[PDB]
Write a protein that binds this DNA or RNA. Structure first.
Ligand SMILES: *C(=O)[C@H](CCSC)NC=O
Ligand SMILES: [K+]
Ligand SMILES: [K+]
Ligand SMILES: [K+]
Ligand SMILES: [K+]
Ligand SMILES: [K+]
Ligand SMILES: [K+]
Ligand SMILES: [Mg+2]
Ligand SMILES: [Mg+2]
Ligand SMILES: [Mg+2]
Ligand SMILES: [Mg+2]
Ligand SMILES: [Mg+2]
Ligand SMILES: [Mg+2]
Ligand SMILES: [Mg+2]
Lengths: 98, 70
RNA sequence: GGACCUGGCGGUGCUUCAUAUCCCUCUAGAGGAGCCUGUUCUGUAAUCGAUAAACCCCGAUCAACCUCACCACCUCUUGCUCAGCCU
RNA sequence: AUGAGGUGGCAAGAAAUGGGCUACAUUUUCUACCCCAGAAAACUACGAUAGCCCUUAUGAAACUUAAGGGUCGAAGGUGGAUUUAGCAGUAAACUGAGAGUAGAGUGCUUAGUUGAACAGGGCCCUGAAGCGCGUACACACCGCCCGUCACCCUCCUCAAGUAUACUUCAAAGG
RNA sequence: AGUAAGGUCAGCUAAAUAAGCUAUCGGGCCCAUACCCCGAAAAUGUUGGUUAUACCCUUCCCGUACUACCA
């Protein structure tokens, strides 16, 4: 469900989501998924559950999700995949033959 | 005679006086620190005279005055 | 760079003027309407030139074809010209 | 083929602008006359040379060019800012001819008729002449030229903290 | 969403005669471009009732102020 919350004279679209597999963390980056397409890439502006801010929601926990990008449109069936990004040392592809 | 050589100096002085009014607060800091090295360089010259004359400490009852104050 | 010369200019001075002239002054007009006509924009596959005074019923005392240089299509090759070209 | 020839064809008008013609009428309109007249006269008036329809003329060819007739009877009711011409047989108004074309202009050239008003007082303006002044202009006042704010390029200075390097010491005393 | 106060031309201000000044458009002025000078366009958010007229009343629309309220 998509909710419109009025805080500070600003309409905040809130995406109500149900965690199916895994957990969501405030720090870890997110991306929006529409029927397999990738709509958005970024971090949540506010993670708030049951009127209480929770950093880590476990599997099966209900959580309302608001993005920092107001242009993002939330539908009834959109999917969201959270992910953790770690920089990895890259080695040169050049092999000299020995 | 014309004043084409005065008009060149007219703007030079105007631009210089307008730059000092814009940087007047930074110039007060530089001059204060420029007067601290000038006084310490004066204290080093006097300390070279009694160290090269064979003494170890300044003559009794001698204090180097701050000659770069207001 | 200094000092001169000439010329131009000056919201530069004096004086004297402008006779259809700068202004006021006399007379009929223009800009207002409709039409004719030219030009500029726009448009079209579809000329050119003039274009402040000193262009704008100007070249044209003049375009239905011709004029015609323009456009489209077709055609010819020592070709009206001891060539030709409004390039 | 940037040459030559043939067939067909476009040259329009949302808009703006210049010049001109005709008018908004009663000093007029129509008729007779060519200056002693009678009518008209505001929603059947004044006023289109436009539109539409027909005919005719020229021409091989005309909704198309021009003329005429018929129908039609609009705007317009005297024109903002500004602006043009003209010193006398002139302006204004009226009339005719001609060039050029097969034909074609409200255009041009030209002949004639009737026939005015102001003309005087000034020096900002437009412009001139004479004697002057000034001038950094000379592609000449649409001239020349001064500063702020930009990329790029070049050099210099200041400067916090720190680091390196160099210099001096015995040219001394016990 | 409610409650309060509200609504002009592109803006704004007066009047309800709908005008004035900017913005816009075109013309004029100049050598030309500005300024400037002239003209034209532009409506009273909407429904009617209501009255000279909408300035009154009402319908609906939008925003303003505040609050309810919502992950
Ligand atoms: C919001 O409160 C959230 C909505 C879930 S919609 C299935 N629920 C719990 O925090
Ligand atoms: K001179
Ligand atoms: K007139
Ligand atoms: K006219
Ligand atoms: K005219
Ligand atoms: K008549
Ligand atoms: K500059
Ligand atoms: Mg200088
Ligand atoms: Mg032409
Ligand atoms: Mg032909
Ligand atoms: Mg040719
Ligand atoms: Mg009649
Ligand atoms: Mg007729
Ligand atoms: Mg002929």
């Amino acid at each position: 469900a998509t909710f419109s919350v009025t805080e500070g004279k600003k309409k905040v679209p809130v995406a109500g989501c149900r965690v199916q597999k895994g957990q969501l963390e405030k720090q870890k980056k997110f991306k929006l998924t529409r029927n397999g397409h990738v709509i958005w890439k970024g971090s949540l502006t506010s993670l708030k559950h049951h009127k209480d801010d929770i950093s880590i929601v476990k599997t099966g926990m209900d959580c309302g999700l608001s993005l920092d990008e107001d242009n993002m449109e939330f539908q009834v069936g959109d999917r969201i995949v959270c992910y953790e990004e770690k920089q990895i040392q890259a080695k040169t592809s050049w092999d000299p033959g020995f | 005679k014309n004043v084409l050589k005065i008009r060149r100096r007219k703007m030079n002085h105007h631009k210089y006086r307008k730059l000092v009014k814009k940087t007047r607060f930074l110039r007060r800091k530089v001059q204060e620190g420029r007067l601290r090295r000038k006084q310490i360089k004066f204290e080093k010259d006097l300390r070279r005279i009694w160290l090269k004359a064979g003494l170890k400490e300044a003559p009794e009852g001698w204090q180097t005055p701050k000659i770069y104050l207001r």
